[PDB]
Amino acid sequence: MLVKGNEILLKAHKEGYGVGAFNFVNFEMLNAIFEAGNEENSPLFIQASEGAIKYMGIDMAVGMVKIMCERYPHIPVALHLDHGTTFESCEKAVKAGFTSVMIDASHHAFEENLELTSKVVKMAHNAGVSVEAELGRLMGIEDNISVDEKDAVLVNPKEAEQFVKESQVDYLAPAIGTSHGAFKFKGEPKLDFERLQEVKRLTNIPLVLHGASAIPDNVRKSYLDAGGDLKGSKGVPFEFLQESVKGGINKVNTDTDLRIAFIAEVRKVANEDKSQFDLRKFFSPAQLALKNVVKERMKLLGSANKI
Amino acid sequence: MLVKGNEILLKAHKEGYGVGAFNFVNFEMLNAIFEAGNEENSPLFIQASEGAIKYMGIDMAVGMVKIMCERYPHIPVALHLDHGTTFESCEKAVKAGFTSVMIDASHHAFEENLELTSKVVKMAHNAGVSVEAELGRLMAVLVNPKEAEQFVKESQVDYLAPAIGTSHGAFKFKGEPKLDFERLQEVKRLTNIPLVLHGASAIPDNVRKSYLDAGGDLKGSKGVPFEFLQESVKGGINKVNTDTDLRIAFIAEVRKVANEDKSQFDLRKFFSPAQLALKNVVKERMKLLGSANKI
Ligand SMILES: O=C(COP(=O)(O)O)N(O)CCCCOP(=O)(O)O
Ligand SMILES: O=C(COP(=O)(O)O)N(O)CCCCOP(=O)(O)O
Ligand SMILES: [Ca+2]
Numbered sequence: 308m309l310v311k312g313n314e315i316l317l318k319a320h321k322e323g324y325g326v327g328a329f330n331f332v333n334f335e336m337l338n339a340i341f342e343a344g345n346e347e348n349s350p351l352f353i354q355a356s357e358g359a360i361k362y363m364g365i366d367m368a369v370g371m372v373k374i375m376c377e378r379y380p381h382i383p384v385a386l387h388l389d390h391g392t393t394f395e396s397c398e399k400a401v402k403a404g405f406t407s408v409m410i411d412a413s414h415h416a417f418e419e420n421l422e423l424t425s426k427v428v429k430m431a432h433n434a435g436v437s438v439e440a441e442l443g444r445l446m447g448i449e450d451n452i453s454v455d456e457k458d459a460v461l462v463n464p465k466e467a468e469q470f471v472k473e474s475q476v477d478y479l480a481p482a483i484g485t486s487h488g489a490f491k492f493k494g495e496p497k498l499d500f501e502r503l504q505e506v507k508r509l510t511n512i513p514l515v516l517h518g519a520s521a522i523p524d525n526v527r528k529s530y531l532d533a534g535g536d537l538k539g540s541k542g543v544p545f546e547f548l549q550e551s552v553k554g555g556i557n558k559v560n561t562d563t564d565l566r567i568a569f570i571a572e573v574r575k576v577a578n579e580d581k582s583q584f585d586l587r588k589f590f591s592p593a594q595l596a597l598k599n600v601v602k603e604r605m606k607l608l609g610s611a612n613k614i
Numbered sequence: 615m616l617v618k619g620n621e622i623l624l625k626a627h628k629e630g631y632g633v634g635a636f637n638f639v640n641f642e643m644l645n646a647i648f649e650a651g652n653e654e655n656s657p658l659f660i661q662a663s664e665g666a667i668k669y670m671g672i673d674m675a676v677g678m679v680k681i682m683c684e685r686y687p688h689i690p691v692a693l694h695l696d697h698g699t700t701f702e703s704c705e706k707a708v709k710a711g712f713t714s715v716m717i718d719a720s721h722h723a724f725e726e727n728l729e730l731t732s733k734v735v736k737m738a739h740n741a742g743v744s745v746e747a748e749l750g751r752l753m754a755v756l757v758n759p760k761e762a763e764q765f766v767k768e769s770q771v772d773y774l775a776p777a778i779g780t781s782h783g784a785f786k787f788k789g790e791p792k793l794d795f796e797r798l799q800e801v802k803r804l805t806n807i808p809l810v811l812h813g814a815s816a817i818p819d820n821v822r823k824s825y826l827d828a829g830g831d832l833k834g835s836k837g838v839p840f841e842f843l844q845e846s847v848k849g850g851i852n853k854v855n856t857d858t859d860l861r862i863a864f865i866a867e868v869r870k871v872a873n874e875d876k877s878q879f880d881l882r883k884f885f886s887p888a889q890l891a892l893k894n895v896v897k898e899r900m901k902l903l904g905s906a907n908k909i
């Protein structure tokens with residue numbers, strides 16, 4: 308059933324596994340994510356960014372989710388606002404029926420981030436919805452990066468301790484070296500697992516990893532075979548995602564992998580039959596590929612069979 | 615708001631216009647259809663086939679439509695089961711919240727068709743939803759006006775789909791387009807109810823061109839000319855099933871995006887243009903059929 312996000316992540320935190328948080332922009336993505344959760348018997352964060360809410364309309368985002376939850380009442384699901392940018396946006400999401408909201412003010416100074424985050428928390432908690440906030444910048448720590456300029460980019464763990472204590476945020480996204488999109492690393496992947504472990508120790512709450520797509524070999528292969536361009540793309544290795552969970556990550560934001568898998572099949576159908584214009588013949592294989600990405604990720608993070 | 619199909623077709627029937635009935639299989643198609651209705655101030659028949667209902671889940675088909683009706687409360691909308699094949703399928707639709715259902719037993723003997731249709735009509739009318747049935751082969755083999763007269767009186771169906779020369783899909787005519795408008799008018803005279811044209815896509819020139827420019831193949835395809843559609847409405851057609859045109863327009867833009875940027879994998883970048891092309895096909899059709907500005 309639809310539940311507050313912190314009910315799902317507190318279980319993950321205590322039992323030491325990670326729960327995939329999967330973005331959707333329409334029916335096909337949503338359906339495939341839910342079918343994956345049903346087949347793997349796994350809890351789920353379903354998320355929509357502000358741009359996805361603009362695309363769908365917030366009434367439709369929430370609406371489709373509630374219908375899916377009624378279809379599969381046994382699956383614990385949190386409906387989560389991804390990268391909320393203002394108090395007002397988080398407020399609209401609460402009113403609309405989201406059960407978790409991210410207020411992302413990581414680009415603001417520490418005092419402003421904490422102030423805005425605390426304001427959202429007071430509002431959300433009053434409505435019985437959980438809150439995520441973020442510290443650090445979601446960009447790659449390039450090689451030859453200043454030893455100090457690294458501490459000006461990644462999460463400052465002492466900041467994280469105070470941040471969580473004063474804001475009462477339910478979960479925290481600490482930047483440890485990932486970033487959004489298909490182009491995460493020039494050269495070999497590297498994440499600050501020491502930093503992660505220090506944050507987990509200091510805060511003792513569920514933590515969130517953004518930019519956690521892996522760009523699996525089979526997915527890259529499907530996209531390339533269908534004539535797509537992924538030159539220079541590098542995701543977070545499966546081994547790193549498991550290490551992240553060991554280090555205290557409980558929510559794993561995954562969006563890019565889903566879209567590559569999905570669009571690879573759309574491109575393939577278009578390539579292989581020029582006369583095809585039944586939408587379902589494009590979107591059925593696309594759904595299956597996305598579903599399969601989600602199912603494998605659920606097993607990897609250890610959320611499979613945790614319902 | 616969401617209304618029984620007869621509310622919409624009776625007005626169209628009395629005032630002599632046609633109302634486009636547009637199929638959807640997901641959110642993008644449904645949103646573009648509704649935005650068309652909003653921009654041309656037109657009533658809407660939104661339909662889902664048995665196949666589309668399997669694809670979406672009937673719970674999602676109805677749910678999405680109701681959300682859209684709440685988004686655009688001024689637009690009269692009928693939610694219609696296209697090509698129901700059994701009593702059971704029609705009943706599920708009534709129970710799920712459809713406000714219109716087609717029971718299609720056209721391929722059966724006249725007697726079986728009338729029998730099954732009368733059963734659906736009894737259940738549906740009991741629940742306040744309208745019913746469409748079909749007579750004739752959509753490809754003698756066309757509707758028999760005297761059969762239609764009897765079929766309508768005994769079955770009490772709200773609207774009828776008489777076969778007059780159309781058929782589904784992009785390949786409607788080997789040669790020149792022809793419809794039996796004489797047959798249409800006789801059916802209209804003898805039944806005096808709203809009539810439904812299936813296989814009504816036109817495959818417009820701009821849509822065909824967008825599809826071919828995008829690498830698609832439409833060799834040999836031919837739809838119902840705009841002029842013939844207008845002649846159909848004049849002859850008594852009030853519901854005009856349109857599906858193929860929307861899909862070609864939509865998929866043309868999807869193909870184009872795939873062609874022009876191999877690195878693009880944001881779904882919205884594919885489906886935003888596809889929605890706009892679909893919306894524009896539907897807007898023009900609303901104007902053509904005369905349902906524009908009827909709100
Ligand atoms: O951390 C992530 C995903 O990480 P990933 O890119 O590795 O999958 N997320 O927060 C999801 C990304 C949201 C962006 O979507 P919009 O373009 O609609 O704003
Ligand atoms: O009459 C028509 C459409 O006519 P058109 O093909 O000229 O647009 N309709 O009844 C629509 C047919 C819908 C079929 O879709 P499925 O494949 O899901 O069964
Ligand atoms: Ca941020």
Ligand SMILES: [Ca+2]
Binds near residue numbers: 719748752
């Ligand atoms: Ca038939």
Ligand code: NA
Binds near residue numbers: 390439
């Ligand atoms: Na988030």
Ligand code: NA
Binds near residue numbers: 695696697716746855
């Ligand atoms: Na129909």
Ligand SMILES: [Zn+2]
Binds near residue numbers: 390487517518560
């Ligand atoms: Zn993110």
Ligand SMILES: [Zn+2]
Binds near residue numbers: 697782812813855
């Ligand atoms: Zn039809």
